[PDB]
Design a protein around this ligand. Structure first.
Ligand SMILES: CCO/N=C/c1ccc(OCCCCCN2CCN(c3ccncc3)C2=O)cc1
Lengths: 245, 297, 58, 50, 58, 58
């Protein structure tokens, strides 16, 4: 009754029989931009059901040696469905998100994934190892698209900060013996009412194994982790031709 | 006018963000209530499910037999203003005589406080911050001496001409704010408002400032947000001839009227550059002290 | 007084008690803040809240 | 005289032993009631947990 | 107070709120001005005003 | 005024009359204290008190 759940939005429905409740980031639901917070004067387009629905974008294989991965929002969706088209044709964009990370195993497997949302997730480099080289991460690493990107040094989240404190951000854990999914709802987070879906990633989604996957020889060894997400209250403005970047 | 039912019963446009929590007054630490032994089935405070994402709701009262304690310990020193409204070093400017850097008797300092670790680590605990500030300027020679020298400090906002010499026409300062003060006078001090085009400054910006291809040579602009670039602070010795003494100006910032949003993990690796979170890959150190075994102190 | 309301905290949820001698309120002191707190926003942002006595998952 | 709260709300000294059961008159063996067939889910008298 | 009214803006259309410590009011601060505006004086000084919806010449 | 009550003597048996210009009351002057005294606490802490006229031991 807290372990069972159904998420329906648009023409898509998700079910789970081993949930661990739902986290509503920073305690607030996504909402549209008010007339006093807004600044741009054109009437926005709010496509509703054609863009606020669940999109299943990627599947990673969890292995005994996996380090963890991250995806950037709204980057992961800029090239998918009607949402992507709207993000490309418009300068301004804003929306919340319902993130549903899936991973099931068996009552004989074990392991725990930390699933968290970190706003303004700026990536850093190892500065040439010695720290004397002022290198910078390449476009494919800051905005990895739907494939996401694997963490090089998970302990410092590839940004000089402790993953041990990542739980200060909206999160859930997928502890195989307990649940098979994580559900996090995130409201729009920015210091501006609207922004570019292309130039700015509002937050990053991190999926990192803290307690390594394990099982005995003979149990299914392929344990996928799938990422499904839905925009909520999407709004777009500043219409012109489509632009991919 | 509307007519089809789905439009009428629509929630499209709701601008009031429903909040699941609300603030309560808490001037002192919580008190402790008398508790006694509980030998029940069904009631189980100690058992939790961290997977949910919430912190434990178990309290002292339900884990052990407690007495009553009237706690009047204040929570006032942990407010944002208490924590941040303490002036710290955020910039340093050198005006040497015969030197490599500024041998012309003037200097331009880019207003960025991320060059000093103490202050930087504190503000980086939050993602967005909005605040006013009090800046204090302490000037003296490299030995800490005070000499009879007159200086001019000028705030040059983005778009205003930056002085290119001790005699630049820009020092006429007809619109920019300037401060004229002697090294012998007490430290100059002024109040600065919240000047960003955004509702808040942000210590982290995961994105690019412009559109286009983000090729190798432009990757230096990843994470650069103009909403954080408030301008230049220029200083010069006031004269047409070179000054007789070498000077140093230390810049202290004291935030006030602070608001902050979205807390984040605190920096655990040394800082290398102002513009980014780069860390030395060959020296990734644990966050704290270590020991030889998990079963020994 | 009769000054400009240009302080960074103008229109904040908490009220301050400050001192000032200039027409711009951002010149004012930091003052005393209001002592409200909302831990749940970060420590307990769950949709369906569970009790202390209950078993969190059922 | 007492004053600290834990002493006031204390149960130290309770001499009345709380009993979970009580005796009932039973001069004869219990009677048998008419019963009929029950074909229910949820109701399960036969199952126990020794 | 009871000072001389020798400020340059004495008898102006807008009222100021200033500070002073001397008997001559021109010694006073600049203060806060009243925020009135009259763009039409420069942007629309036509004798017979035309609407937005209308064709300016007919 | 409307300051923090962080003086070392906050909640003392004697009342003070002090001056201050800051939001923290420990910054205040020493002021004037209340002139109460209790010599008996040290000079006559006996359980059963005896008179002046009486013979102390009987
Ligand atoms: C007569 C001249 O007196 N004026 C002095 C003066 C002092 C400070 C001043 O502006 C200080 C603004 C401080 C803002 C610091 N911030 C805002 C966010 N930010 C930042 C830096 C690096 N990355 C992201 C954000 C910053 O470094 C303007 C004038």
């Amino acid at each position: 009754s807290d372990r069972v759940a159904q998420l329906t939005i648009g023409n898509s429905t998700i079910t789970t029989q081993e949930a661990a409740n739902i986290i509503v980031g920073y305690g607030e639901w996504p909402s549209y931009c008010s007339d006093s917070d807004a600044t741009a004067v054109d009437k926005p387009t709010r496509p509703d059901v054609s863009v606020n629905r669940f999109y299943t974008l990627d599947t990673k294989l969890w292995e005994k040696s996996s380090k963890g991965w991250y995806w950037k929002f709204p980057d992961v969706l800029t090239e998918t469905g009607v949402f992507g088209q709207n993000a490309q044709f418009h300068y301004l964009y804003r929306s919340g998100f319902c993130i549903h990370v899936q991973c099931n195993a068996s009552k004989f497997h074990q392991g725990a994934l930390l699933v968290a949302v970190l706003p303004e997730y700026v990536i850093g480099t190892v500065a040439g190892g010695t720290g004397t080289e002022d290198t910078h991460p390449p476009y494919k690493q800051t905005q990895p698209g739907a494939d996401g990107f694997e963490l090089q040094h998970p302990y410092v989240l590839d940004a000089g900060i402790p993953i041990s404190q990542l739980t200060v951000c909206p999160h859930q854990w997928i502890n195989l013996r307990t649940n098979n999914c994580a559900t996090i709802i995130v409201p729009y987070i920015n210091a501006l009412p609207f922004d570019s879906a292309l130039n700015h990633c509002n937050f990053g989604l991190l999926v990192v194994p803290i307690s390594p996957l394990d099982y005995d020889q003979g149990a299914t060894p392929v344990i996928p982790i799938t990422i499904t997400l839905a925009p909520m209250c999407s709004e777009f403005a500043g219409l012109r031709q489509a632009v991919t970047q | 006018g509307d007519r089809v039912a789905d439009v009428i019963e629509s929630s499209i446009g709701d601008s009031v963000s429903r909040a699941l929590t609300h603030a309560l007054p808490a001037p002192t630490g919580q008190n402790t209530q008398v508790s006694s032994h509980r030998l029940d089935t069904g009631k189980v405070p100690a058992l939790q499910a961290a997977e949910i994402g919430a912190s434990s709701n178990a309290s002292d009262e339900s884990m052990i037999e407690t007495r009553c304690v009237l706690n009047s310990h204040s929570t006032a020193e942990t407010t944002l203003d208490s924590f941040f409204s303490r002036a710290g070093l955020v910039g340093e400017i050198d005006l040497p005589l015969k030197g490599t850097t500024n041998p012309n008797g003037y200097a331009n300092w880019d207003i960025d406080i991320t060059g000093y670790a103490q202050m930087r680590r504190k503000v980086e605990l939050f993602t967005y911050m909005r605040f006013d500030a009090e800046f204090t300027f302490v000037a003296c020679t490299p030995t800490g001496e005070v000499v009879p020298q007159l200086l001019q400090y000028m705030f040059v906002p983005p778009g205003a001409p930056k002085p290119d010499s001790r005699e630049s026409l820009a020092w006429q300062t007809a619109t920019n704010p300037s401060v004229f003060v002697k090294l012998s006078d007490p430290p100059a001090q002024v109040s600065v408002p919240f000047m960003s085009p955004a509702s808040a400054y942000q210590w982290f910006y995961d994105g690019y400032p412009t559109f286009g291809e983000h090729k190798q040579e432009k990757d230096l602009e990843y994470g650069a947000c103009p909403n954080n670039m408030m301008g230049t602070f220029s200083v010069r010795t006031v004269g047409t001839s070179k000054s007789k003494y070498p000077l140093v100006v230390r810049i202290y910032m004291r935030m006030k009227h602070v608001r902050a949003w979205i807390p984040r993990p605190m920096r655990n690796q040394n800082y290398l550059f102002k513009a980014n979170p780069n860390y030395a890959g060959n020296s990734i150190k644990p966050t704290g002290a270590s020991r030889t075994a998990i079963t020994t102190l | 007084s009769h000054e400009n309301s240009n302080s960074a905290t103008e229109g904040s949820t908490i009220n301050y008690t400050t001192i000032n001698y200039y027409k711009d309120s951002y010149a004012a002191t930091a003052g005393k803040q209001s002592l409200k707190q909302d831990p749940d926003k970060f420590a307990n942002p769950v949709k369906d809240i569970f009790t202390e006595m209950a078993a969190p998952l059922k």
